[PDB]
Amino acid sequence: RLPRAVREQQMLDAAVDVFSDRGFHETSMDAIAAKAEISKPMLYLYYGSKDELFAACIQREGLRFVEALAPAGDPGLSPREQLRRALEGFLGFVGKHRKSWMVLYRQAMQQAFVGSVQSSRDRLIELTAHLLESSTKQDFELIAIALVGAGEAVADRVAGGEIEVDAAADLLESLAWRGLAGK
Amino acid sequence: RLPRAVREQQMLDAAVDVFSDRGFHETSMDAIAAKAEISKPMLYLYYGSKDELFAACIQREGLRFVEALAPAGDPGLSPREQLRRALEGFLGFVGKHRKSWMVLYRQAMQQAFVGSVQSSRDRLIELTAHLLESSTKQDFELIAIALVGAGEAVADRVAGGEIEVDAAADLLESLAWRGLAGK
């Protein structure tokens, strides 16, 4: 009769839809319940409020996001190859999971989930400065912040299918090594 | 007994506070009314709902924002000097009006005011590609999007006083002319 993470995954997929479709405030438990084709009373027995569901959804899409970066965390990798693999994983994920990129990029810097993912964002900026430092033997935090901001806006266009992953990863790699060596 | 845009300006300044302090959902008409030191019934006779106030506030801070870009729209200016003047106006505004940058950058890409300022953002991206094109005699929309995304994230650090306007405008100018000529 549909056990564990299966009813779960259906509710979260539908929440993602409605949240990315309409945004947090204009999304309703009503509309999510219809999308999951489950009863509204049912939904509340799992989530209980719109924002609690919004945080579960945010938690889950956040996870797929960092998993997509995982290959960059591989061992023996040159700074360059970590950056390239992260850019490509990030950008490939957005391209395939545009709905979840939208929820995420929104949550980032609503305010409720603006401190889960801004702290995530900041951690990501910190990771980037270290690898930019890990390259050439604080202009570095600064290049990092500019590169992440650039990646965020470019990701938007990748999610909307206006830019190919490769074209996008290409631009971001050289912004990083040539905003670096450039001025 | 305090006539026109004076009661106005007091209510909008206080709304800006509370919205930037707490975010849209966790801001209340309650808290705004206390901040403006006006009665709550009073507030509703001008605004009538939280989001209507939020749009007035968004309208007003959006205006100061584009006014800050105005010197770049001057005549006879080289592409380079338009870009430099826009970067400096944008970044000087964020530095002085951090509360309003926060409301704005949030509204941009809530969803209610995500289509006022995303269309603003997009128009800004379009203006940037044209001047990047107006320089060297669509890699251009693409550099534009990356430069705006970079400016947004850097603006954040400028608003938080972690980066000086000049340092920030410097990095963005060369990202633009060297992500351009770089790869």
Structural account:
2 copies of one chain form a homodimer. Chain A has 183 residues and is an all-alpha fold. Chain A has one domain (1-183): Tetracycline Repressor, domain 2, CATH 1.10.357. The first copy, chain A, contains 9 helices and no strands. In chain A, helix 4 packs across helix 5, helix 4 packs across helix 6 (98-107) and helix 5 (79-96) packs across helix 6. The PDB classes it as transcription regulator. Keywords: APC5888, TetR, Rhodococcus sp. RHA1, structural genomics, PSI-2, protein structure initiative, midwest center for structural genomics, mcsg, DNA-binding, Transcription, Transcription regulation, transcription regulator. The assembly is dimeric.
CATH architecture grouping of chain A: Orthogonal Bundle
CA-based gyration radius of chain A: 18 Å
| Quaternary organisation | homodimer
Q: How many structural domains in the coordinates of chain A?
A: 1
Query: What's the number of extended β-strand segments of chain A?
Result: 0
- H/E order of the elements of chain A? HHHHHHHHH
Decide which structural class fits the backbone of chain A. mainly alpha
Largest interface: A-B, 40 and 40 residues
* Total helical segments of chain A: 9
**Cα shape of chain A:** elongated
Under the CATH scheme, which class of chain A? Mainly Alpha
Name the CATH superfamily assignment of chain A: Tetracycline Repressor, domain 2
N-C termini distance of chain A: 62 Å
Strand content of chain A: under 5%
Portion in helices of chain A: over 70%
Task: Characterize the main sheet of chain A.
Answer: none
Kindly report the CATH topology of chain A: Tetracycline Repressor, domain 2
Protein name (chains A, B): Probable transcriptional regulator
Domain HTH tetR-type (chains A, B): 5-65
InterPro entries (chains A, B): DesT_TetR_C, Homeodomain-like_sf, HTH-type_TetR-like_transc_reg, HTH_TetR, Tet_transcr_reg_TetR-rel_C_sf
Organism (chains A, B): Rhodococcus jostii (strain RHA1)
